[PDB]
Design a protein around this nucleic acid. Sequence first.
DNA 1: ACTCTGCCTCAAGACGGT
DNA 2: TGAGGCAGAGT
DNA 3: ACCGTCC
Length: 341
Amino acid sequence: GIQGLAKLIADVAPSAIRENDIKSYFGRKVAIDASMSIYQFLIAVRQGGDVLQNEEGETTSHLMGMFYRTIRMMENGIKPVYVFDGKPPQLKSGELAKRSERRAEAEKQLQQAQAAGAEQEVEKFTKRLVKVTKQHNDECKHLLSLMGIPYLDAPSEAEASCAALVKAGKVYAAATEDMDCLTFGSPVLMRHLTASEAKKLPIQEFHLSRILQELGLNQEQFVDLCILLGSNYCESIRGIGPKRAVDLIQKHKSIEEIVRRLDPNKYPVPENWLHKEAHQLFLEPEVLDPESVELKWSEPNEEELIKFMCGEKQFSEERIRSGVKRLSKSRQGSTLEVLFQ
DNA sequence: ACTCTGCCTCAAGACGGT
DNA sequence: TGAGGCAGAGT
DNA sequence: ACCGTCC
Ligand SMILES: [K+]
Ligand SMILES: [Sm+3]
Ligand SMILES: [Sm+3]
Ligand SMILES: [Sm+3]
Ligand SMILES: [Sm+3]
Ligand SMILES: [Sm+3]
Ligand SMILES: [Sm+3]
Ligand SMILES: [Sm+3]
Ligand SMILES: [Sm+3]
């Protein structure tokens, strides 16, 4: 994530945000950050503070959400490809070590809530410790295969590979809630694309070209601004927030020039600042090759889906069968069968 | 006045019968 | 892998 | 649309 970027764009670059009705997206392809989607389901899909599960004690909240949300998108003619995280970049090792502290610190506090018979504090440290395991990813990949929905393994950060799929024109936008994708150069970011029937927030498109235009920056200058706002890969400058960062970038263009012209006593920079390495990461990240795999939306395997979701994971057979039928019908409406010449 | 930091909290999905 | 709200301090 | 329920 980029600290405050969403608010900054709304304040100084409003024309980069465009809203459209769900009906206008029939036939459009999008890339989804699968790991983020799983994380959201593990936190939100709960009954009595506990994730859904089968009698064997196996979590099914992530399968619940991925099954029904994916079908809803396809019913609206939206064809998603799910991108799974790979090995994180080394620059993130600092941010991850921090996530270990707040995790061990959150573990340090879950017991005192349970021991003292806490009421609603147990459910808080529970959610705080949610983490997507490789079993979660493998089960979702398994589900998507049976649903006929394509997925991809990113070599590193999924958001970077999503951005690369948009750049190559293999999907229209990266559908996620983190502004990371824009810093990785995604031409289009889409927010609030759940295709739910609730419909509370409007579908928002963030267009990078409009952002660069209203801020008067090129991409490398935009990346330096995001570094000054605050990223996951390096430190920012204390006392430099969104208002001053924009002014400094617009005036000095680069972080290097900002340092040379900054007053060490007023605004000292971090010691051994890795802004140059984070700069290279955002602009030239390790990403999948968009030309390798041709994305295909295939017929779902209904009977295997029943065996897996119902027989093993104990979903309602009526609901799963109904869902598979809706998915097959919606794919037939939005997708052309393969042709040979 | 404007700006930034560090606290606080609050939320975080979807189906289907009504 | 948050977003606002608020008080207090720096500019 | 609300809300009990999903697993
Ligand atoms: K800062
Ligand atoms: Sm990110
Ligand atoms: Sm419980
Ligand atoms: Sm089992
Ligand atoms: Sm620390
Ligand atoms: Sm990631
Ligand atoms: Sm990520
Ligand atoms: Sm992100
Ligand atoms: Sm079993």
